[PDB]
């Protein structure tokens, strides 16, 4: 407790020491302060260091210890590298002291591996035996050197056929050896086959060259690997040539990464990168999304024996953050790629130009030190800077010319998908790779050409790679043939299509290509039964599609109309998965736009340069630490149930793609485990860029997954669960919901004019909830009446619920018209619902006889809480109170001065169960104002819960003018989304502390003017579908005169001799009001607004 305070007060003072600690081992710049403390502390354990090798290096997973001595390292892919000489460890040795030794020892070990592997291969040894001896990197480099030498020898003459046949034999031998090898050897051979196929392509191209000059020109364009024979410095004995220029191999451990197929675009990009690095410039790639830019940069780094460090740029990267990252990468000597470099602010882009130019100049003139950010730091001569950017997308700025002139740009508009597909299929083992790849490419082009022009249809390289990825685990159940490809195509591409596009897809699949899941459908049905849904064909199909998509893709997008079935779909599927597999499920739901970007990810306390985790960062870090071992065997789902703002979402571009790394401004690198999946629940894709649509698998909801009957059944079986009475009541209510009679009512309600238009499919919740609550509230008086009377009362209650749930947002004319249809479609034998039907304590009566004549005092006209009871006032108060008591949100809409506040306050005044918290919404309202209005009314009780200060009365939020708050530049409102979260999820995240707060006894009502009034803003239906809507129009002129005659009588009680004149004064007043409203309209002046408030 207080000891933690004493530790914290000195923890902040340690930062000035941690910064100078990073100056000794520069790779500490990739670690947070909380990890630096653990590394320094572990003087004797030496095991805390082995947990961070991935952050510091990238390709190293853990150290291998043997009795206080370093023996070797283990790559991420499980490969083992043994050091030439073990590093003997002493207790007094600080972490940096032996880390700096290990860094060089790894390089020496890699060089020794390469040297003796090359020596063995030069003696006629075949490639199929050395794969069991050395790491993949050594075999790769030695094979490249020998291929270069032999191709040069063959270039000395015109003979290429012999070497080509030797290469083909080697390829066939490796392909056959692939089957009978372990996992590690399988990875080694699979990575080697890519380079051998590249060798074969180059040799064939040389073989087809007509003359020597053409062959020399072709040879000058590919990468050549040489080796000096004079230098005694081993680490600089290998260089790489392409188009005349030279670069130096670094002999740094890379592991066994996934390797790209050598395509012409890749080689031309290699040439541009070499040409730019020759003069110590930067390298730039630009083009559309998903064309290989980042991955080709990483491959270029791999071929030069070094791991490329990738940062995901963002607007939160201010000048100091970028400059500090530059200081880190310049001291380390690494190759930093700044992906999505456009996403920075224009000002920061202008500001970092001097730093970039300074780095370039220091590299060119061979300076030793560079002064970025007020301190002179050393400059390693191995650094390089790369940027990749997407021109012309949403939420991206433009590089100033003084910065553009510091890079060399290359366009990567269109990759060669045919070669990639063919080579990947050939390696994967398919018998007919060429025809299959050509068919896949042709089919993808046909889809992109013939299908509808939906804004989210992309069939580029990422789609092809996903299709290929789905083929690896399908070969066992379908065979390496056309069937596997077709089924994977259905598995990947179909879930994203519309209605007609599905038919087009089927037709094209039939034309181009020639041609058991019971264990999971049983689990799906069990889950649906537990949650009470109905497993129709559409719902089951969507569930199966979601199940098969998540099997290989770690991030899914669920798009569909409001209330179409997204949340039910993924909740049911994850429950079924938990039943099927036995793995626990941990679910976090985040309403994205409610939180700011700083609360979502984090923010540096610039007064201290101290990092503070955001909500998502905290969740990811807590999962990665895994203190208690809980998250070992669980699936973790993070649901982003909000709009897809580009600026909120593209900060996870590195998270979503193959990098699987969250990059933070302070340099931290939190990995994404395979059991950490991310969901995007949304209703439109208007502002989403193709950069994120291509990264995630997409599931499109073309229509509702449910029928009205099954939805009503689910709602009834849910409302019953919240209660001998039940067995009879369920039968009675389920009988009274006769869908044959109900469907006509539902389709007839569509012709009415609805303010704040909400689909009829979304009002069934209100109807069912209100009906069940009303029926339950009379259960005491059900023991002592016949079947006919019970049926009549239940029918009347249900008719009232239908009337106020389907037509409640329409004028009194429309309501009166709709009552007739409701009466006629239930049959005329049943109890008739009238305009003012009511139940009295039991008999049926009307509101008309219940009007209480009132006589105000003269002085009572000044009290703002005096309401003159009329028929409309009584009816509205009764319905509003009934809706409030049903624990359902309410929105009251009407023109100004109609009286919404009047009825609300009058209904809640005479009650001892509720309190009112008046909150006002203006054009610029934040959630902080809402939380501030609750401070004096609520308590924080602990997880964390928020309760009213009282223990008896519930709390009601009078939220008026909810149309007013403005939309941001991407068409979303913070406050309305917050209210939606409050009603739907009954909770919210406490942003500065990352905790979930549960709302206990707080109801929410709203008040607003029609959206046609000036300055009013449309509302997301995802918000309005949770609230019952009542329209409340102006009283009639007769009603107005009847109301104000009572006021004038009360006033004229002061002047009795003129009491006979009360009626003409009221008539004159209402006539003046009507005439003023008619003449001086808002078409003359904007403020010519009149209402009964003037009366």
């Amino acid at each position: 407790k207080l000891t933690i305070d004493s530790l914290k007060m000195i923890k902040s003072s340690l930062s000035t020491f941690l910064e100078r600690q990073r100056r000794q081992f520069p790779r500490f710049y990739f670690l947070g302060n909380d990890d630096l403390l653990k590394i320094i502390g572990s003087g004797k354990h030496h095991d805390q260091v082995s947990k961070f090798m991935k952050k510091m290096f990238g390709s190293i997973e853990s150290i291998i210890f043997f009795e206080d001595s370093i023996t070797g390292v283990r790559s991420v892919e499980g490969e083992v590298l043994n050091l030439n000489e073990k590093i003997e460890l002493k207790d007094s040795i600080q972490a940096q002291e032996w880390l700096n030794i290990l860094d060089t020892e790894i390089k020496l070990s890699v060089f020794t591996q390469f040297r003796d592997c090359l020596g063995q291969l030069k003696d006629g040894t075949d490639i199929e035996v050395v794969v069991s001896k050395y790491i993949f990197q050594a075999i790769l480099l030695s094979a490249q050197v020998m291929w270069t030498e032999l191709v040069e020898k063959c270039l000395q003459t015109n003979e290429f056929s012999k070497y080509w046949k030797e290469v083909d034999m080697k390829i066939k031998g490796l392909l056959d050896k692939l089957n009978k090898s372990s996992d590690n050897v399988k990875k080694k051979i699979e990575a080697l086959l890519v380079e051998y196929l590249h060798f074969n392509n180059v040799i064939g191209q040389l073989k087809n060259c007509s003359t020597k000059e053409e062959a020399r020109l072709l040879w000058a364009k590919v990468q050549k690997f040489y080796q000096k024979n004079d230098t005694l410095d081993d680490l600089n004995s290998v260089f790489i040539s392409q188009s005349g220029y030279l670069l130096q191999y670094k002999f740094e451990y890379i592991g066994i990464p996934e390797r790209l197929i050598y395509t012409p675009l890749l080689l031309v990009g290699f040439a541009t990168l070499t040409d730019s690095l020759h003069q110590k410039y930067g390298g730039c790639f630009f083009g559309p999304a998903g064309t290989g830019k980042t991955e080709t940069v990483k491959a270029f780094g791999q071929n030069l024996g070094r791991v490329v460090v990738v940062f995901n740029c963002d607007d939160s990267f201010d000048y100091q953050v970028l400059s500090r990252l530059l200081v880190g990468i310049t001291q380390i000597g690494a190759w930093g790629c700044f992906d999505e470099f456009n996403r920075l602010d224009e000002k920061v882009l202008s500001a970092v130009s001097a730093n970039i130019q300074q780095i370039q100049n220091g590299l060119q003139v061979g300076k030793s030190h560079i002064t970025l950010l007020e301190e002179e730091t050393p400059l390693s001569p191995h650094t390089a800077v790369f940027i990749t950017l997407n021109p012309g997308y949403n939420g991206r700025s433009e590089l100033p010319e003084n910065l553009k002139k510091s890079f060399r740009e290359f366009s990567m508009k269109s990759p060669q998908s045919g070669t990639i597909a063919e080579m990947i299929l050939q390696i994967m083992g398919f018998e007919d790779s060429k025809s299959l790849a050509s068919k896949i490419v042709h089919f993808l082009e046909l889809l992109s050409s013939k299908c509808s022009s939906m804004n989210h249809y992309h069939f580029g390289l990422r789609t092809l790679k996903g299709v290929l990825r789905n083929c690896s685990p399908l070969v066992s159940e379908f065979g390496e043939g056309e069937k596997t490809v077709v089924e994977s195509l259905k598995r990947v591409i179909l879930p994203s299509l519309g209605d007609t596009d599905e038919l087009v897809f089927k037709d094209e699949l039939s034309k181009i290509f020639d041609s058991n899941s019971k264990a999971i459908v049983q689990c799906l049905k069990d889950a649906g039964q537990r949650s009470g849904f109905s497993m129709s064909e559409e719902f089951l199909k969507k569930c199966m599609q979601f199940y098969y998509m998540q099997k290989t893709q770690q991030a899914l997008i669920l798009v569909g109309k409001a209330g179409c079935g997204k949340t039910a779909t993924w909740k049911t599927v994850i429950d079924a998965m938990a039943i099927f597999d036995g793995h626990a499920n941990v679910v976090y739901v985040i309403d994205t736009k409610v939180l700011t970007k700083e609360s979502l990810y984090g923010s540096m306390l610039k007064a201290t340069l101290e990092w503070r985790d955001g909500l998502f960062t905290s969740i990811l870090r807590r999962v990665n630490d895994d203190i208690t071992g809980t998250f070992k065997n669980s699936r973790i789902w993070v649901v982003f149930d909000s709009d897809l703002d580009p600026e909120y979402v593209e900060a996870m571009n590195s998270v979503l793609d193959d990098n699987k790394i969250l990059t933070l401004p302070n340099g931290e690198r939190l990995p994404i485990p395979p059991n950490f999946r991310i969901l995007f629940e949304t209703d439109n894709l208007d502002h989403t860029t193709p950069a994120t649509i291509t990264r995630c698998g997409l599931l499109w909801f073309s229509t509702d997954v449910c029928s009205i009957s099954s939805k009503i059944d689910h709602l009834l079986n849910k409302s019953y669960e919240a209660l001998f009475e039940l067995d009879k009541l369920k039968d009675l209510i389920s009988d009274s919901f006769d869908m044959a009679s109900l469907t006509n009512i539902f389709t007839c309600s569509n012709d009415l004019v609805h303010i704040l238009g909400v689909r009829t499919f979304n009002k069934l919740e209100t109807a069912v909830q209100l009906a069940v609550h009303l029926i339950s509230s009379y259960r005491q008086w059900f023991q002592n009446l016949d079947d006919k009377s019970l049926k009549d009362v239940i029918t009347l209650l249900i008719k009232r619920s239908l009337l106020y749930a389907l037509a409640g947002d329409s004028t009194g004319e429309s309501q009166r018209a709709f009552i007739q249809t409701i009466n006629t479609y239930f049959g005329h034998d049943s109890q008739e619902l009238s305009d003012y039907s009511t139940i009295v304590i039991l008999s049926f009566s009307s509101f008309c006889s219940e009007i209480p004549s009132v006589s105000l005092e003269a002085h009572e006209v000044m009290r703002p809480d005096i309401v003159i009871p009329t028929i409309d006032t009584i009816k509205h108060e009764k319905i509003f109170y009934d809706l409030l008591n049903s624990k359902r949100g309410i929105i009251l809409c009407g023109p100004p001065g109609s009286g919404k506040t009047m009825i609300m306050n009058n209904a809640l005044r005479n009650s001892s169960l509720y309190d009112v918290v008046g909150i006002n919404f203006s054009k610029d309202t934040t959630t902080e104002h809402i939380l501030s209005a609750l401070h004096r009314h609520t308590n924080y009780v602990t997880g964390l819960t928020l309760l009213p200060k009282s223990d008896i009365k519930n709390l009601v939020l009078f939220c008026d003018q909810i149309n007013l708050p403005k939309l941001d530049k991407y068409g979303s409102q913070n406050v309305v989304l917050f209210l939606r979260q409050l009603m739907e999820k009954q909770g919210f995240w406490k942003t500065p502390e990352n905790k979930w707060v549960t709302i206990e006894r707080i109801h929410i009502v709203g008040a607003c003017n029609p959206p046609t009034d000036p300055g009013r803003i449309p509302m997301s239906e995802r918000f309005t579908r949770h609230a019952a809507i009542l329209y409340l129009g102006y009283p009639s002129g007769k009603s107005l005169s009847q109301i104000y005659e009572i006021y004038y009588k009360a006033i004229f009680k002061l002047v009795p001799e003129f009491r006979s004149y009360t009626e003409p004064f009221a008539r004159a007043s209402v006539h003046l009001y009507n005439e003023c409203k008619a003449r001086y309209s808002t078409g003359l002046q904007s403020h010519y607004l009149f209402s009964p408030r003037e009366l």
Binding site: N920, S922, K923, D924, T925, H929, A933, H935, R936, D960
Partner: protein, 67 residues
């Protein structure tokens, strides 16, 4: 100068108070001051609800804003 000024004015007129100004420990300071002033007038108000409802009533009585 800024829209936040107009938002504060909207809150002040729509309600009879600005909840943003009074919270944290300022709420407790205001509660102490209201206790003292209410005792000085011989009025018996104990619960925080009565105190603040008297606060907002006094504000509603004794504040006129002219634009």
């Amino acid at each position: 100068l800024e829209t936040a000024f107009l938002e504060r004015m909207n809150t002040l007129l729509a309600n009879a108070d600005i909840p943003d100004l009074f919270q944290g420990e300022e709420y407790d300071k205001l509660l102490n001051n209201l206790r003292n002033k209410t005792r000085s007038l011989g009025l018996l108000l104990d619960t925080e609800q009565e105190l603040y409802d008297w606060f907002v009533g006094e504000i509603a009585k004794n504040l006129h804003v002219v634009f």
